[PDB]
Design a protein around this nucleic acid. Structure first.
Ligand SMILES: [Mg+2]
Ligand SMILES: [Mg+2]
Ligand SMILES: [Mg+2]
Ligand SMILES: [Mg+2]
Ligand SMILES: [Mg+2]
Ligand SMILES: [Mg+2]
Ligand SMILES: [Mg+2]
Lengths: 99, 127, 100, 114, 79, 107
RNA sequence: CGGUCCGGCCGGGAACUCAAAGGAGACUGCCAGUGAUAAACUGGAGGAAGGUGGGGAUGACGUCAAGUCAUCAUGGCCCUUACGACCAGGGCUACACACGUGCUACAAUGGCGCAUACAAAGAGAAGCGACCUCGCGAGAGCAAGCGGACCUCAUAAAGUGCGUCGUAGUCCGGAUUGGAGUCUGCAACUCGACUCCAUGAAGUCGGAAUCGCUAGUAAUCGUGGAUCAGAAUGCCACGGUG
């Protein structure tokens, strides 16, 4: 079989901290992982008015950066599964598992 | 022996693969005359191979994605110059003199708030 | 907006999942079926007796905190001015001023 | 070459010369030449009389003459004599199908005069 | 404009037609359905079409079949 | 211009003939960024001037350029193109070819 | 490199392009002249980039009782079987005119027809919706894939190649109008979008006056998104040629 973990977060310096802890734990217990791959960032952009009335020209410029990380695990070792499945990760990281 | 050089433009990206000896040009599994519909686009890639003489002397195998007519052609023209510097390494002084190794980094100016275009302002009243 | 105007919108949503969620969903299909009941489906006449305020076209997406019917965003459910007030005080995660 | 459409077509290509008939545009002129068997770039020269009257037979299915002028007009007479809202728009020269009347109604209203 | 799968008519106005055909012609019928399509079973009756503030009676004619009742009520007074 | 005194940009020359001056000529006729349709008109106009109106195509344009004289060459090329549009012939290649024939014979 | 059903499609390859986490690199650093030996300027080399490289964010004290009690927050006042509240329809879209802001034009640097090449950036689950089939078409039916670098919107348009029209109110331009239809939605009359047939106004480059912009800019070409059941010539972004 093959399990993969899709990781998404808002902060780029926070997504790689949660990514490296999974890969280091996997290499220590003897699992085969072909590293993490950087997926293209799906970034939204929001341009809305700052004024409630006339002077239309002054606006705000927002963005929402959503990075993506994927870790591919080849062998479903029981020592690998039992360790990674209940890790204590960052609150700003959403996990997606495909068993 | 292969000699590689990366050249690109606004949204293009082109690879250059050099093999010694032919006058063959293969771009995206097509010919030089078949792919380039513009006659100017055929000649601008011949511009870096003007000071350095090529007739039937080296292969070039190129692919390119993105951009347009001259955006792909400018990507090839940059990529050949880095390949010849990889090929001979003494040819740099002639390439610096022509100005082809300088990557054209003039990108598009962003669309501004309050204006319909990058610098074009909507029409103005005096009083 | 006015408090009575937001009471209208809650009344429309409460009828929206009530009547037109699944019942008008069926009545939209039976009028659309090409295979059977090509002439006498009569689902149009039964749709007339249903109340109007269940309609998804009649409801208006408004700001959940103020009730402004203008400048709506489906990303947060707020008006354009209330997006700034939570962003400057750090109440919306990841939202900040952009430069490109 | 005089058709049942008595107004004389110009001495040019076939699909252009059929456009001069009131009620035959570019699309319908393609359909007549396709049903006849005449190429669209054939001029009035060498277009023999055996090829003119076979264009009269294909155009005979449609009413394209002053008889078409009255049927457009009497259809408007149906609206005006009935007294409908759409009939009131044609009598004063106002737009019908939802064009605005604040400004930019110059085709309907006629030339300006304060 | 409207699709061919069913010309629209309101339910309350359709009931007012059915009693009027059987029980004979009456006083002009006050209604608000400016969106209904005229059917051939209404020829002869007088239907008062509401125009914003009043009711204008419309004597139904044979060639009115297919049009709307809102096309017989001017909504503004022009001077 | 008051303080910022800078030079003028040096465009790449004509890829067909290797002429710096002819590259500034096609940009005047070019509208809406259409380079590919502009040089097709200019090349077809000069071949009419070369084959049926006098050999030495590069020299034949210069004789037409000399009578109507950086800025001196710029105003000379602009007067040829703008007067060619308001003519009676059919295409732009035929109109600009007759302007160079008239400018070579200074009329 | 093997494999050919000529599709990266399949074994595989980790080179390269792309994708994004970190880092190097440009600092008048080096040389020459000018300048009071200064700051600096000028010229040249090196370099992908050289004189704040390109763009953005970043906008002092104050000025106009400039704009916002109709985003919201807030002192007071006023009404309260009514200045409140419910619903139907109408109006906000009217029409003798005026002003400002836009689009498409007046065309052979084009129009139309056939064949055909190259984008970047986004959106998608009460959603995007392929393929197949049908209709001239707007679409409809059948029905996968996809919470997505996989699948869909989605064939980018200008351009290129040929043919045609030959300078005219025209195969220019499409206004207006009639007829016949499509989709959305309780519901398209007032007042929707789009397609098909037909009609083919004004207009042949625009007075005084007035505006934008010093380079990937102007000009022009289409694409996408927000708002939205539906309703973009506006606004926001994105690239193509230049
Ligand atoms: Mg309040
Ligand atoms: Mg609505
Ligand atoms: Mg005609
Ligand atoms: Mg970096
Ligand atoms: Mg004031
Ligand atoms: Mg036309
Ligand atoms: Mg400036």
């Amino acid at each position: 079989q093959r399990i993969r973990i899709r990781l998404k977060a808002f902060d780029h310096r926070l997504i790689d901290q949660a990514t490296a802890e999974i890969v280091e734990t996997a290499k220590r217990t003897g699992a085969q992982v072909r590293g993490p791959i950087p997926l293209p960032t799906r970034k939204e952009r929001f341009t809305v008015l700052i004024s409630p009335h006339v002077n239309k020209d002054a606006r705000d410029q927002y963005e929402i950066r959503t990075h993506l990380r994927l870790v591919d695990i080849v062998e479903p070792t029981e020592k690998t599964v039992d360790a990674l499945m209940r890790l204590d990760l960052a609150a700003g990281v959403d996990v997606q598992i495909s068993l | 022996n292969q000699y590689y050089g990366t050249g690109r433009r606004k949204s293009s990206a082109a690879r250059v693969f050099i093999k010694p000896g032919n006058g063959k040009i293969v771009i995206n599994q097509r010919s030089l005359e078949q792919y380039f519909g513009r006659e100017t686009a055929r000649m601008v890639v011949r511009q870096p191979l003007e000071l350095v003489d090529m007739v039937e002397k080296l292969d070039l195998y190129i692919t390119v994605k993105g951009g347009g007519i001259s955006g792909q052609a400018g990507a090839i023209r940059h990529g050949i110059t880095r390949a010849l510097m990889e090929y001979d390494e003494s040819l740099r002084s002639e390439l610096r003199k022509a100005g082809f190794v300088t990557r054209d980094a003039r990108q598009v100016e962003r669309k501004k708030v309050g204006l319909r275009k990058a610098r074009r302002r909507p029409q103005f009243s005096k009083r | 907006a006015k408090q009575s105007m937001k009471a209208r919108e809650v009344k429309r949503v409460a009828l929206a999942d009530k009547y037109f969620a699944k019942r008008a969903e069926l009545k939209a299909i039976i009028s659309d079926v090409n295979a059977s009941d090509e002439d006498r489906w009569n689902a149009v006449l039964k749709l007339q007796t249903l109340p109007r305020d269940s309609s998804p076209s009649r409801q208006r997406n408004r700001c959940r905190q103020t009730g402004r019917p203008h400048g709506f965003l489906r990303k947060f459910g707020l008006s354009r001015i209330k997006v700034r007030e939570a962003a400057m005080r750090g109440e919306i995660p990841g939202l900040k001023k952009a430069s490109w | 070459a005089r058709i049942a459409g008595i107004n004389i077509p110009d001495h040019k290509h076939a699909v252009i010369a059929l456009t001069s008939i009131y009620g035959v545009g570019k699309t319908r002129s393609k359909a007549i030449l396709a049903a006849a068997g005449i190429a669209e770039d054939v001029k009035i020269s060498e277009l023999s009389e055996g090829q003119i009257d076979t264009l009269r037979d294909e155009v005979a299915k449609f009413v394209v003459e002053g008889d078409l002028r009255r049927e457009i007009s009497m259809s408007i007479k149906r609206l005006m004599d009935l007294g409908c809202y759409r009939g009131l728009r044609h009598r004063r020269g106002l737009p019908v199908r939802g064009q605005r009347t604040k400004t930019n109604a110059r085709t309907r209203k006629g030339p300006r005069k304060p | 404009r409207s699709l061919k799968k069913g010309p629209f008519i309101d339910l309350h106005l359709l009931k007012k037609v059915e009693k009027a055909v059987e029980s004979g012609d009456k006083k002009p019928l006050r209604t608000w359905s400016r969106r209904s399509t005229i059917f051939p079973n209404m020829i002869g009756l007088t239907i008062a079409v509401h125009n914003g503030r009043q009711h204008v009676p419309v004597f139904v004619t044979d060639e009115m079949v297919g049009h709307k009742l809102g096309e017989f009520a001017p909504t503004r007074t022009y001077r | 211009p008051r303080r910022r005194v800078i030079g003028q940009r040096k465009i790449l020359p004509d890829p067909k003939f290797g002429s710096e001056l002819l590259a500034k000529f096609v940009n005047i006729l070019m509208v809406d960024g259409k380079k590919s349709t502009a040089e097709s008109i200019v090349y077809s106009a000069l071949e009419t001037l070369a084959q049926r109106s006098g050999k030495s195509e590069l020299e034949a344009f210069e004789v037409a350029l000399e009578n109507v004289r950086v800025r001196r060459n710029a105003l000379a090329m602009r007067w040829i193109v703008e007067a060619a549009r308001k003519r009676g012939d059919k295409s732009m290649a035929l109109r600009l070819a007759n302007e160079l024939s008239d400018a070579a014979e200074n009329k």
